[PDB]
Design a binder for this molecule. Sequence first.
Ligand SMILES: CC(=O)N[C@@H]1[C@@H](O)[C@H](O)[C@@H](CO)O[C@H]1O
Length: 522
Amino acid sequence: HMAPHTIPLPAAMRVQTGESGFSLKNGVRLPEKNPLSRQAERIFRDNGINTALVKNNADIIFTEDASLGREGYRLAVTPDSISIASGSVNGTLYALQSLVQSIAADKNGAPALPRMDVKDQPRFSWRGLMVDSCRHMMPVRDIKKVLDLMERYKFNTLHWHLTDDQGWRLPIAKYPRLTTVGGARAQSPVIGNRNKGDGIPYSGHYTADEIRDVVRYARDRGITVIPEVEMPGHASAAIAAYPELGNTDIPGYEPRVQETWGVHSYTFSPTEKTFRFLEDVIDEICALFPDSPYIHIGGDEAPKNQWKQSPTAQRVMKDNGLANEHELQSYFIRRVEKMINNRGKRLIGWDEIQEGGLSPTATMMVWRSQMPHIAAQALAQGNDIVMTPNSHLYFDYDQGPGKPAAPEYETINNNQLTWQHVYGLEPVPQGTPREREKQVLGCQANIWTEYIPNLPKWEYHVFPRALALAEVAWTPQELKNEKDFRKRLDRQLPFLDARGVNYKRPDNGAPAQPKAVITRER
Ligand SMILES: CC(=O)N[C@@H]1[C@@H](O)[C@H](O)[C@@H](CO)O[C@H]1O
């Protein structure tokens, strides 16, 4: 039998390629009473293997071992049975995904599994992708395709970037204008000519039932959805909907849902009214994401100028003994953190949240790789971090050669972040004390959508880079090997082809689906 092509590479795997394996030519019999068989049914059928729910003498034996924890598993494949041990449902999902990526043709060309044993568990507990639904919005049906592929590669976290300057997508019943006004912009930058507007309104939001459906579908695939509501910056859509939430006393105050990309100046005012609005929003977020351990508050790229120009903000600073607008930002984050903690969740924010003082309880999402001291200081102060470095995991960035020259394939910049570059990432900062390595929760790629209007382009930007990230996030650093990874990656392509995924071809860099239509039309 050929060697398994599983990505991420398991931590321990012994394959006896010369021994008799388990033939799949007649499908797999699943124990009908075990709820886990429903997930096995789904995963085997995704890979072209027939299944049947049987009362007696199933082929798969599910066993429980609490020592395997939330995500660890064991696999034992003999000619007689396929045994899967886990400590939780998600460990079983991961065993099943490893199993299907161990399928190879037998002597007669029928699918079979080798005689093999696997014991596996992830290096990092946070293994994420971030979807930006604000710059362009992707429908639930497309998010579900993303979630299916995330489970296959053992990603466990979808960070959902739901509010920004160019659109607010998160349904809040108490403040309907956030979506009816804040969900709509009058135009977008022209594709191929970002410095001009297209004159075409662009709007959308998720309904409450759609939010909950995504959360549930993700959870059934082992994925926790973590919501992000941006503050105090990236707030133009919310402020356009409710102008009293911004710095209304500045010269030239004219909030609007923004039509252009980049950093915008409209920040929330640090007032009691704004804090009550945010508490109301956080309350509804907790109802929509009841199982999320975190609420991401954003915190990036909030220019201080409007606060400098606002007598209201200056008075808040004097009231609270704040010497400058960085301390004002720290104060803002501290007050929102209390709202989140009072609902039993943890705050996470982009690495700008250390400005004016990093809360000792906040979790930091590290993205500005050009400022390595920020992550080092956060770790030294005892804080947990998640690594989303712009040096490696900004999947809006370009890749290696081979892409079409057409404007539809344009990207934000000409930085080439290839899958090879991603594969060489090591998330733990150099010189981190051994006892502080547990504060590095994991890593995640961010897929900003200024230049990604729809799913085929999203797939080109994300695959195969996310497969390299999946291995970085799961596999021990010392087991990574680019040459072997390429072999396994090449063996993933038939599965991705059968789903019509528009990945960037490893061989020549062209789209796998060169005729896919990339459009803003929804
Ligand atoms: C935390 C973060 O990444 N902030 C912005 C982001 O809003 C934008 O979409 C991205 C495009 O690369 O550029 C970053 O500066």
